[model samples]
Target chain A: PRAEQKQQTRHALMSAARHLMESGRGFGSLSLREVTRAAGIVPAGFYRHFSDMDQLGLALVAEVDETFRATLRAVRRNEFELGGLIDASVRIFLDAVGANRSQFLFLAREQYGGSLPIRQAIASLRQRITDDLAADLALLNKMPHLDGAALDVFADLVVKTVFATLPELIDPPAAKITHQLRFIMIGGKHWH
Target chain B: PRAEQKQQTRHALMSAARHLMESGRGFGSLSLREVTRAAGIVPAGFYRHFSDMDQLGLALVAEVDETFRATLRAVRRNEFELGGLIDASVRIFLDAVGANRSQFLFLAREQYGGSLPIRQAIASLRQRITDDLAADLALLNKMPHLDGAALDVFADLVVKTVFATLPELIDPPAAKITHQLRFIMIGGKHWH
Candidate 1:
């Protein structure tokens, strides 16, 4: 196959996998035959794209992570007071979670329950994101009193809260998302 | 069948369902045949206990909720000062989540990602739990100065934190769980 055709096939396979999981199915229940059949590709053709379902699951995660990276980057570029930052950050995230519903669903649903490797990849990548966010929080220089460990616990609060809130994105009530973020921010301010 | 025999079959079916889900499968992927086979019964035998898989899923959720109720009730029976309440409440919640791993995993994994009915069942039950926690927080009167809505937002922070933390219960770091609860409690104290 030509390179373009190969890429298209790969994209189709990933889309197929996401569609299955997005329909409230768990990654644990996915089979290669079902995924390929959904993609309108024969079983033999699946090998040309992904070596196995684990790789496919990881690809789904990477796609959503890229979307998050882009949206978060845009949010980080602008400045705001802490409250406004919390508001804007959630607004931006809610928007992405809405726009990329299936991808976000795959990550949120599978984060704890997917195949072991998929779960580990998500956990590691998520920790890296939390670490990066912790670095960002530190640079804000608001927590001079806090040591690195405390700072991470603080960051984990935000990331986990965000993780906890993403499921509400399917049909978000605008105010509740903002409220949750602000509540966490208030808690952060009080952390010694 | 004798009433006792029927109850035994029902118990067996629910156990089989929980076994499947706790093994990393989502509730959505479950089928009647799969569940009955796991229970060592014919497919036709399932309907005697459940109208369908959704009904069985809800039953599984309730089984776990019963465990939570017992734990939470015990915690309520014990008296505590403010700090002690926060510490004891979390210790109890974490312990229940650990002991009832399959049940908790079902609700956590399926809360966002399960089929509509299963997700709704978990969401409704979860909201009820959050509401109850809010009531408990109000009775404590630690945040006597805040209005009802503000208190709930604070309560939600705790409940959501708990919800976020449940997935980690498979093999938890007991200290981190306590610290997260404390961090939020400290934030709660500082909230207006």
Candidate 2:
């Protein structure tokens, strides 16, 4: 129970930072005092949860990775009509973004922001996503013309395109995103 | 001549900030003193160039837009073989990125960063590029099945995909980017 309480407090701190960043503020611009205040903890108490704001930012990235992995798993595990796959996947992706708006927003902003470590962390996360998507596409054998390298190239584009649309996902450009994904799939089909 | 000299000083200030940010530091973390120092001006003289770092950041965004527009115009003005448009455009685009590495890097990082004004500026810049590309594609008449809106959608994907790859462009991922653009075009061709 004590450890669980500690975990809750840690989560509260990260949530508070996300709220602060949701206003479009970069993590570098956030102050420890403000984060602690928003988390309902005294400034000194912040250390108990995080050594520094950057550490907290890293923690948030980890959370985003987990949430993203889970969402991908859920989307891939479900059975859908072949024609509905893109629609279903886009819908599920946007739904997850809507549910965890702040965390995803944080990820979008920090993907190329100041902190090298945070940027590197997000890059690795993206690479992992790309690799997984490539493997999935290969297993599905929908685009047999694309060998492993070609699959990786196509998967990289899809992952980057999806991430590039995250800001718009704030208000949910559902149909447009679906069309974009469909267009990419069509391209994959036609690739030599 | 005096005004021309002043313009040179202003460019120097912006260039200095870009250099500092080239190492992956966000504008928000930079100080006026550091920028002026790097620019070879007294700290107090920074006011003569701009009011604050944010203003300087806005100026940098404006410069980036201008440079990008110029690059697009140059690429579009040149005629390429039907089969070589993507290759030619991608080559020219990466060449421009190579020439102005720091500014493009700044845009990539600040596109979703803390400052509202900077983010908005980059957003407008992207929209303008998308619109131009759509019009160009329409005039080229390569994809007759797509209307203006569809063209805009395709162009938007292209712009976002290109911008999303800027970091990789820092080291010039030429072959992969060409493949990605080709895939996107193939998709555009196949889109209903």
Candidate 3:
């Protein structure tokens, strides 16, 4: 029971951090005291969960990591075609943001603007996601003209474009996203 | 001489604000007092230059506006070929940042993460730029199937992709950006 309670408290800290971030405060702008207060714990108790905000920030990135992993899994099950894959990827992202608003919102806000360590963590995660995508593109034998390095660069562009759309995903008429993704897929088809 | 001093003080305040923001602080997160102190002026004296930070932000955006207008003219005069235009756009941006580093640096930092009005102003300027690109694309009458609306969407995607390259502009070994843009143009060629 004690271990379970401790785990619950830790989860609370993480959620409180995410809430703060989504409230327009990046992790670099957050304070330990404010986070602990929001989590319904004393500031001293924060040490029980993580060493500093950096660790907490990394943990939050992992939470988003898990969210995108699920997205990739769903995209994997889609038919191996550019149009279908692009559609599935955007659909899963929109749905995932609906379920995990705080994580997605925080990731979008901090993707380019944050402390050095926090920014590094986010960049590393994005690179990993891009690698996953380039491998899949390879599996589909798409864009045959791109050599290995070129293929990875193209994958990065695709992923970066998708990332730019996350802010719009937060609140928009749904048709807008489908339109944007379809255009990119069309570009992808003629890209080689 | 008195008017010259007033102009100097206003420039000082603007520089202070840009310095604070480039130090990883977003415009929304900065206080007028902090900016005045950095500029070595009394907080109450801030109004001599601008009413508030929002006004100051608009001024900053106008500064970048002028910078890009010059870039646009140069890009327009370049050979109308797509490859040359894309390469020239990227090169002009890199060189412009070198001369106007603070302006580009601050604009990139606050583009998405600033207060509401500042974000809106930045968004408006970007839309204007994208509209110009779409007009040129339409004049060129390229792209097999994209109508005007689709052309605007494609233009937006291209602009956003270039904006995403802002952080990398800070200090890159510099081969990566041109390669990425070329791939996109190649994709753009086949996109229709």
Candidate 4:
């Protein structure tokens, strides 16, 4: 019971941080006192769960990591035909962004703008996502021209395209995103 | 002479803000006092130049706008063949980012993460860039399939790809960027 309570408190702190940022505040501007107070805890209690606000920001990035991993999994499972694959993957990504608005917003904001540590963390996250996509593309073997380094470069482009479009997804009509992804896939298809 | 001094002071304040942010600090956390002090002026003197920090940030964005416009003009003048066009454009862009490190960093950090006004300003800048690229493509009339809305979409994707890879440019060996841009162009060529 004590362990469960501790876990609950930890979760509360994380959620409170996200809640604070919903007002368009960057995590760098958030104070530990404000976060703890919002979480129904004392200032001293913050160290009990995390070392500093940057750590809490990392925790948020971790949550985002999990969210994207789940998104990748869903995309993997929904393996329909080629066109359907692009459509389903994009739709799933947009749905994930909608359902996890705060986390996705955190990513969209911090991926480039956050602190050094947080930025590096997000960079690694992107690299991993790119790697996963590259591996998946290798498995598909559809694009014979994109082998080895070329394949990795192609996957990286796809990952960049998706993330580059993230802010728009947070603020869009889906058809535009659908069109954008389809265009890239078309590019990938004929990349000799 | 008095007006020239005032303009110099204003330029100093803006450069100081950019300099302060050189150590990886975001613009939102900068204090007016610090900025003015860095510019060798009194804190109150900041008001003589701009109303507030956000306004100063907009000034920085405007500087970035001018820098990119010069880049567009340079790109237009190059007028190489298709392959050389991609190569020259990417080289010119990388050079611009290197030369205008602070401003590009400011844009990279703030485009998604800065205050609302700043973010919106950057968004409009991107829109204008996309429009410019679309117009260029239309004039080329190379890709008959990419007309009207499709051309706009293609140009937007190109802009996003360039901006998305910006952090990498700031952080590679130029071969990687050259390859990335070439791949996209290849994709565009065969994007029917």
Top-TM-score candidate index: 2
Query: Tens-digit lDDT track for model 4 on B23-137?
Result: 6678987899999989999888899999999999999999988998898878877754655776777788778888988778777777777787888899999999999989888
Query: What is the C-alpha lDDT profile of model 1 across A1-192, one tens digit per residue?
Result: 489988998998898888777666777778999999999899989888888888988888888888877877877775445547766766777777778888887777777777777878889878988998888878888667667887898888878987776666653356766776665566666666
Q: Which stretches of candidate 4 lie over 4 Å from their true place?
A: A80-83, B80-83
Per-residue lDDT of model 4, residues A1-192, tens digit only: 689898899999998888777776788878899999999999999998999999999999999999989989999887636557776777888788899988887888788877888988999999999998888888878677777898788788788888888787664446766777666666667775
Candidate 1 vs candidate 4: the TM-score winner is 4
Full candidate order by TM-score, most accurate first: 2, 4, 1, 3
Please report, as a residue range, the 10-residue window in candidate 4 chain A with the lowest summed lDDT.
A169-178
lDDT of 3 by residue, B1-192 (tens): 689999999989888888787665667667899999999999999999999888998898888888877877677677475456666767776787778777877777777776667777888999998998898778887665678887887788778877777776753424567776666555456654
Candidates 1 and 3, the one with greater DockQ: 1
Candidate 3 has a DockQ of 0.48
Off by over 4 Å in 1: A20-22, A30-34, A79-83, A171-174, B30-34, B78-82
Best lDDT goes to which candidate? 2
Per-residue CA lDDT of model 1 for B1-38, tens digit only, reads 48998999898888878778766666767789988999
Q: Residue A45 CA error for candidate 1 (Å)?
A: 2.7
User: What does the lDDT come to for candidate 4?
Assistant: 0.82
DockQ for all candidate structures vs. native? 0.57, 0.83, 0.48, 0.65
lDDT per residue as tens, model 2, B98-180 = 89999888887787784878878888999999998898888879888899888888888888998889878773377899999
Interface RMSD value for candidate 1, one decimal? 2.3
